[PDB]
Amino acid sequence: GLIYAVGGFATLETESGELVPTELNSVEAYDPERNEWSLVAPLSTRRSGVGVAVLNGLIYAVGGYDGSPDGSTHLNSVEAYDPERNEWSLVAPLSTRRSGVGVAVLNGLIYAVGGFATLETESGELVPTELNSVEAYDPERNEWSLVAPLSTRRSGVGVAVLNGLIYAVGGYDGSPDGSTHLNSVEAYDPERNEWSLVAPLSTRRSGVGVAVLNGLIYAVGGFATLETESGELVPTELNSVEAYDPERNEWSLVAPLSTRRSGVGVAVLNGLIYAVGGYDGSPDGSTHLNSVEAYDPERNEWSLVAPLSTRRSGVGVAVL
Numbered sequence: 001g002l003i004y005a006v007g008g009f010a011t012l013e014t015e016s017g018e019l020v021p022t023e024l025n026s027v028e029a030y031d032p033e034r035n036e037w038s039l040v041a042p043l044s045t046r047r048s049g050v051g052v053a054v055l056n057g058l059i060y061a062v063g064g065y066d067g068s069p070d071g072s073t074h075l076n077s078v079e080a081y082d083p084e085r086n087e088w089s090l091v092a093p094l095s096t097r098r099s100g101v102g103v104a105v106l107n108g109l110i111y112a113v114g115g116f117a118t119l120e121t122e123s124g125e126l127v128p129t130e131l132n133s134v135e136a137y138d139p140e141r142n143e144w145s146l147v148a149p150l151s152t153r154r155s156g157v158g159v160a161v162l163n164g165l166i167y168a169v170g171g172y173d174g175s176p177d178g179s180t181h182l183n184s185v186e187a188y189d190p191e192r193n194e195w196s197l198v199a200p201l202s203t204r205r206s207g208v209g210v211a212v213l214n215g216l217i218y219a220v221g222g223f224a225t226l227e228t229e230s231g232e233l234v235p236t237e238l239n240s241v242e243a244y245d246p247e248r249n250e251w252s253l254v255a256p257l258s259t260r261r262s263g264v265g266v267a268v269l270n271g272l273i274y275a276v277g278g279y280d281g282s283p284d285g286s287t288h289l290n291s292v293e294a295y296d297p298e299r300n301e302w303s304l305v306a307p308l309s310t311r312r313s314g315v316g317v318a319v320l
Contacts (some may be wrong), residue, residue, distance in 0.1 A: 001031075001032075001270075001319075002320060003029065003317060003318075004028070004029050004030075004319070005029075005276050005316075006061050006315065006316040006318070007023070007024050007043055007046070007047045007052075007312070007314075007316055008288075008310075008312025008314050008315035008316075009021070009023050009024060009049075009067070009313050010288040010313065021067060023067060024312055024315075027042055027043060028309060030274070030292070030305075035305055036306055037307075037308055039309070040081075040086055041086045041088055042088070043061060043088055044088055045079065047063075047064030048312075048313065049063075049155075049263070050063060050065075050075075051063055051064075051101040051115075051159070052103065052265070053104055053105045055105045055109075055110055055139060057082075058080045058139075058320075060080050060110055061078065062094065062101060063097065063115060064314075064316075072097070073099070073118065074097040076094040077090065078091050078094060078137070091137075096135070098117055098155075099155065100115050100157070101113065101155070101157075102157040102168060104161045104166050106165075106166055106190060108138075109136045109137060109190075111134060111159070111166055112136075113168050114150055114157045114159075115130075115155050115157075116172075130153035130174060131154075132150040132152065132153040133146065134150060134188070135147070149195070150168060151195055152173075152186065154170075154172060154173055154182055156170075156207040156263070157170060157171030157182075158171075158209055158210025160210045160211055160212045162212045162246060164190070165187045166187065166190075167185060167187050167188075169219050170184075170201055170204065170219065171206055172206035180206070181206045181223065181225060182204055182205075182206065183203065184201075185199065198246075199250055203222075203226075203240055205219065205224055206223050207221075207222050207223050207262035207264070207278075207314075208220065208221060208264075209265060209266030209317075210266060211266045211273050213268045213272075213295075216297075218243050218266070218295070219241065219242045219251070220266045220273065221262055221275065221278065222237075223236065223281070236260075237260035237261055239261075241253070241254050241255065254297075255295070255300045255302055257275060257302055258304065259278075259291055259293065261278030261280055262278055263278050263279040264277060264278030265316055265317030267319045268319065269319045271296075272294045272295060273295035275292065275293045275295070276308065277289050277312040279313035286311070287313070289312075290312070292308065293305070
């Protein structure tokens, strides 16, 4: 019955007044009855672009990014939060490091979908790699195993479960060739161990937050390079929200966010979608967001609720 905001990144002022890039280990919990965020136990490992999902009463924080000049940049480590003990434990790491990984839970397994890493070639060269690999975590065995890969390599992908399928929505591909911001959507059938294509988003979006409510998938916010009427390509944080109906295999627009944002954490609690934090790369205004919006599907409206105590982009969000 609480929303947990896990990790993320912000530029924060020191006591001496210097602004420093900070990957976050802090975790905040939102109580909707009180409309308040409160700190809980922090992650062991500071991380942003982390995938977060709930399984068997525990929150799992999977992979992520650490831009510090020391140490690994792309993480394979996985932490598990016990709310009764208010403690984070380490579990088995991913086989492949991945930042900007999407995670969802289906049939008692955690799926880690896509992401990005710098990986060594056979010749020893380090190359930037968007990932198509998908790993599944069995908590009874404390083991990750490979399942079928995505058709399309992608990071910053939104992942959610609907009607026994995992949907991988949008994302980012930094290759020098081809589209950088994705509208494509894939669906994973665990019985067949197969990914299929479904209807694409109307607007391409990387760093999109995805949640399922009342039988629809909502794709919330994100970022894309979009052509203006004059033909110029401009970087655009998105406020648009699209809803996917699996019976019709169609996306439709619903009410937009008040605040354009990417790298936003999205989760469902008590029949509302919460959009938590995120990133705004505009040359004006705050870059890392503490604001939180709540979507009512009956009224088709987004409202503001209490903001996070610490701004955070690339935050993972789950409900427990």
